[PDB]
Design a protein around this ligand. Structure first.
Ligand SMILES: O=[N+]([O-])c1ccc(O)c([N+](=O)[O-])c1
Ligand SMILES: O=[N+]([O-])c1ccc(O)c([N+](=O)[O-])c1
Ligand SMILES: O=[N+]([O-])c1ccc(O)c([N+](=O)[O-])c1
Ligand SMILES: *[C@H]1O[C@H](CO)[C@@H](O)[C@H](O)[C@H]1F
Ligand SMILES: *[C@H]1O[C@H](CO)[C@@H](O)[C@H](O)[C@H]1F
Ligand SMILES: *[C@H]1O[C@H](CO)[C@@H](O)[C@H](O)[C@H]1F
Lengths: 491, 491, 491
């Protein structure tokens, strides 16, 4: 136990299921892998500060001071990509490494680092896809005005994005402004389990001085305004050759109705609106979902007409970060129910078990990843049918192997990860067969890394990081399958 | 002009399109046909009072003092039904004729009248279906406590319903508690064009001392509570033989999205929720649609758990009163839009013309009846798929011939009405073929009658009332088609 | 007014909706743009003669003496194509410029002109598609034997086509023999509104000495025989490398049944047979539609077996010239109906309004272009399902901005044209998704031009021709959208 049935061998995807232009890759983020947290002039991020001031808020009491040491070891990351035959690497730029004070003087050592990584990727026939921000805010701006809670973040972000465009845009042609705004707003400002660790008085987070009903929406609104400003600038000044693309990457769960009835059908649409539509609908039509405005009202800021027009059609490419699905169970509006957390505003509870008593799918290791590839195909067809079928990349997809799971004693023997990934790659094929414009699949993660409030205890890598042997990269079974899948010539 | 294309002859329904148990009939209401407004002890209704105090609020300055004089001439109504071969007559009981003071002593002359009509119908092999209330509130209760705006209406209604059950239930086996609660709430308390004629200060109605954002919902809430009390009583004490049925009859428009986009898809669902779900969803699940609660909030009263349980599953039969359809056009929530009328709360405007510039269908006479039979089939399949496929009767369906329409110079030559009715009867067949549990079709109206704020200027009858020749009943072309359709033996 | 709803921004096509080989372009014709009508030895065409002898038959009393002056200004046409990022230009060769006397000595100045245009296109990475004849008959042949009414046109055309193949075929690899034979036969010989302007005695055209029941079919028969001879020659002598293609371009309207009944279903098939099948069915199977032979009989010439075999499978590529759709309304055969115009022979009237009284779609400017993109998808699926799914190019598609339309005061602000074109490009995507072999979309027109009997009063261009400023080319809003769509590098 617990029952883990693998695909039959004839059901395993082959590279030629996908056309020649389809892109397989892997993703990381700066705080999760780089280390060198204070090296060569780098200033502290909100994640540096959060870990150093509230260390107990990380599961295993670790932090990203060193992580996988990719600041020094990036050539081994490149080698792992090459060895697996990946065509794309999606990585993030550390704002605090580039602009130690958030604003002002650029750190040339930071510029030099990303240039080396970019040039090495290109030397090795791997295309760089760059996430500009991945939760990674300079603590200087957090101290100065409250970071994403203040409007000043909009212009400061724009100027940081411009440094990235100016320095890297001659070679980097594909950009994501923000990664997982919904996760970030919920966890950083609703539950407060993520940096800067804020929540309402009386709640259990590092800093219970916020407002779990308001601060998530304030932060999300500034993200969207920052995104709109950066894209306007990009399209006006940094796409002169017409061959660059900029978008946003969204965390998305699939949803099924908890019970077969029109009420859970309605709840399911509210859940998708809340999880996905919150940030996707603004970049599509220039406003939040109607459901959210009707339920959240004055706690959800209004866009001006100028802002609406700037936001509408502001993505060339959409990233979907998909792991799992939930059942959506209707909650009635009544005096017996009063929202206290931002997620309460959907009036739909996310359930791991459905009306018949069954889990949505098999657990994969970490508590929240239940396997349900159907959910991904469903979301991709929503993108197709509802939102105009924009170009979609799966920019994260994968599972954790968890320390203490006795069904996973050899960290290299990740047949469960491999099976999960094969099933989701097959689910992408299903969506493509049904007309969804899906352009690539990027596994999270390239290498085991710092899993936020769970530290190193959750390993998401295709490639093992041997923390006791100098952070050496070792290909897992899943990685070696990708070598075969991608027809990498053998030694 | 204007273009009115008729069905091809092979597309005209035949009686055998429907099974042997399907019921064809016609409908009327007490204020619209009875006259004798103050005869034999009858007390005044809100419609008596409205017309007598604000006569100018009726188009042609008429009222229902005499109407079709069916109080004296009901045998001619029965004869018209028989001559057309109708199997059902749906008529209403005048509360103020039965209980002149709303409460207290029953008027035996009122009882005697309905007994004669019921017995004549049964003598003539026509089944009576009885609407208990059709907008027809005793002015005594209006004066005493504000009628449907006060909770006292709930018990007073229950006691009136009980008088009807006690006196007529040995012979009448099919009941509708209320007719068109949505029309009544919108027009009587929102726009105020109908009795008692109330609306917000500054609006143009007889009594601008109300609140068009609140009074419609207060009135509708009491209707639902009154319905729940009457049905509980009926099922406990007046269905001992197990063969009686009680339900409610709803005015419903079909809706199509104004423009092909997910936003007007969403608007269309809000329009259906507002028009149909407002009263239907309470009698199905025991609460209002979620959409309405989310948009109306404190202006929409809450049900107690006891009330919810009483309301859920409180209809044996559903009546649908269908005339026409609209395009539903999304309205955004923003500072630029502030509801002032209850209908504003759907955030969906009802449009007669769609995105391509075309009317939804041909005009039929009166300004609001655009022909669109597709809309009826669509609503019937919603009943099937969403609300459990309860037994449905089309309890009103038809068109007006309007005074001054030069395309309708002979009031008996109603080929346009006939064509409309044939097309809607065919639309019911379509729904039945698709599995909808539709049990009958009742034309509105049996006879030309008092059309509320339009007076006698709109003629809806299968049977002409010759107002200059003693209110004589004369069969129109449509009526004579029903004689043929129903295989009535000829003289 | 009048209501013009635009696509939602997420519904606007993107270039990547189409595969890498799909071709976007624009079209013109020689008489409509070239001017220089008598320059460098060019002889007069039937259109020169028609305008110079019956000037009043042109709306605004203009002609194509100068047009857009593309004889001198073709480099600006090329520049406009390049600026929009178009990959194909479809233009026509003026027969009377190449062979001033129709037959005999070739005009080397004419040859030199087309060589310059071809070479400039190729220098600018634009592929030339060449229409050999576009209504453009030498008046010498018209005077000599009645042009397309005489069999001699067949060989004379063949010899002209051969001059084009010999001189241009080393570089031009894609050819259309004839453009819009159905429009030409109807308007030039039925109604007579187009050159040479012939119709039956008693009708209102310049020369009422013809026969509107016969001359259209005689002319069309010679077109088909000329096409068959030119293609036989081409395939035998001018496709030695195997990489050239030759076809024909057909004007086509979509049709819907006027009323839902089997009779208008039948009428709709006769309308499509008459409009499209007249010329398409011969090049597919080698005979006219059966419907036309059954109704037209002796007025429709027979093909010999040799001719049938030559015609069958004589197109490598099909062009569809699509603007609009109509309702098709059945006409009975009876003594009360006697054809007088060739179009009467379909026994199906083309109606702009349907049975419900609604226009088929919104008017776009000129009286005959009602927007109905569905109609194009429908026709493309007929090509797929009925006629073997040959390679199809949309070789014309667009709208006119009309002088005096107060809803179009700035001739550059053609958002209505842009919306129409986006919707039709989306309709082509729909057809492709459904398996139709559609290979390109060419907007009519590249530049505003001479719109036949309407003169310059109808502007169809992506690119404005400023007639008061030296015939300068100015990109309209639609043109600038194509620059973005095609990712043209910016200055
Ligand atoms: O719990 N989640 O749904 C969820 C989603 C994305 C995430 O990136 C994380 N996370 O990093 O802990 C958590
Ligand atoms: O305007 N309406 O939708 C509407 C509906 C039902 C009705 O009964 C009436 N009415 O009696 O005037 C009007
Ligand atoms: O009226 N038409 O259907 C129609 C079609 C194609 C055409 O090219 C023209 N035209 O040039 O006037 C007219
Ligand atoms: C997406 O999810 C993974 C797994 O939770 C995180 O580690 C990444 O930072 C986030 F982008
Ligand atoms: C349903 O509609 C008809 C026509 O508007 C009214 O006359 C009836 O009273 C109502 F029940
Ligand atoms: C196709 O139609 C356009 C618009 O009517 C004409 O100008 C062209 O000559 C014809 F090819």
């Amino acid at each position: 136990g617990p029952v883990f049935t693998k695909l039959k061998p004839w059901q395993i995807p082959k590279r030629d299921w996908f056309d020649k232009d389809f892109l397989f890759g892997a993703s990381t983020s700066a705080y999760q892998i780089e280390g060198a947290w204070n090296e060569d002039g780098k200033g502290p991020s909100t994640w540096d500060h959060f870990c150093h001031t509230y260390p107990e808020r990380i599961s295993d009491m670790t932090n990203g001071d060193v992580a996988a040491n990719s600041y020094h070891l990036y050539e081994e990351d490149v080698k792992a990509l090459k060895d697996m035959g990946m065509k794309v690497y999606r990585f993030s730029i550390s704002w605090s490494r580039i602009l130690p004070d958030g604003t002002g003087k650029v750190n040339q050592a930071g510029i030099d680092y990303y240039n080396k990584l970019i040039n090495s990727l290109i030397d090795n026939d791997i295309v760089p896809y760059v996430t500009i921000w991945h939760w990674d805010t300079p603590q200087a701006l957090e101290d100065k005005y409250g970071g994403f809670l203040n409007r000043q973040i909009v212009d400061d972000y724009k100027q940081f994005a411009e440094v990235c465009f100016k320095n890297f845009g001659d070679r980097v042609k594909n950009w994501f402004t923000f990664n997982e705004p919904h996760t970030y707003c919920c966890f950083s400002y609703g539950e407060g389990i993520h940096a800067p660790g804020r929540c309402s008085p009386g709640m259990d987070c590092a800093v219970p001085e916020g407002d779990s009903l308001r601060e998530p929406y304030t932060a999300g609104h500034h993200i969207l305004l920052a995104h709109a400003e950066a894209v306007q600038l990009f399209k006006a000044r940094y796409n002169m050759h017409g061959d660059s693309k900029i978008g946003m990457a969204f965390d998305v769960m699939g949803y099924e109705p908890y019970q077969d009835s029109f009420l859970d059908d309605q709840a399911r649409e509210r859940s998708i609106d809340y999880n996905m539509g919150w940030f996707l609908e603004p970049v599509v039509r220039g406003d939040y979902p109607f459901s959210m405005r009707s339920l959240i009202g004055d706690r959800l800021p209004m866009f001006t007409k100028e802002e609406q027009e700037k936001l509408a059609s502001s993505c060339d490419i959409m990233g979907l970060n998909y792991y799992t699905s939930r059942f959506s169970k209707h909650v009635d509006m009544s005096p017996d129910f009063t929202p206290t957390l931002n997620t309460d505003d959907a009036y739909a509870s996310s359930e791991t078990t459905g009306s018949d008593g069954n889990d949505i799918g098999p657990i994969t290791g970490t508590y929240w990843i239940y396997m349900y590839p159907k959910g991904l195909t469903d979301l991709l067809l929503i993108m197709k049918e509802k939102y105009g079928n924009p170009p979609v990349f799966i920019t994260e997809n994968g599972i954790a192997d968890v320390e203490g799971d006795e069904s996973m004693p050899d960290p290299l023997d990740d047949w469960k990860r491999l099976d999960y990934l094969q099933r989701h790659i097959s689910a992408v094929k299903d969506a493509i067969d049904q007309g969804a414009d899906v352009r690539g699949h990027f596994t999270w993660g390239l290498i085991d890394n710092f899993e936020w409030s769970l530290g190193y205890s959750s390993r998401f890598g295709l490639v093992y990081i041997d923390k006791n042997d100098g952070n050496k990269r070792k290909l897992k079974k899943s990685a070696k399958w990708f070598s075969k899948f991608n027809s990498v010539p053998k030694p």
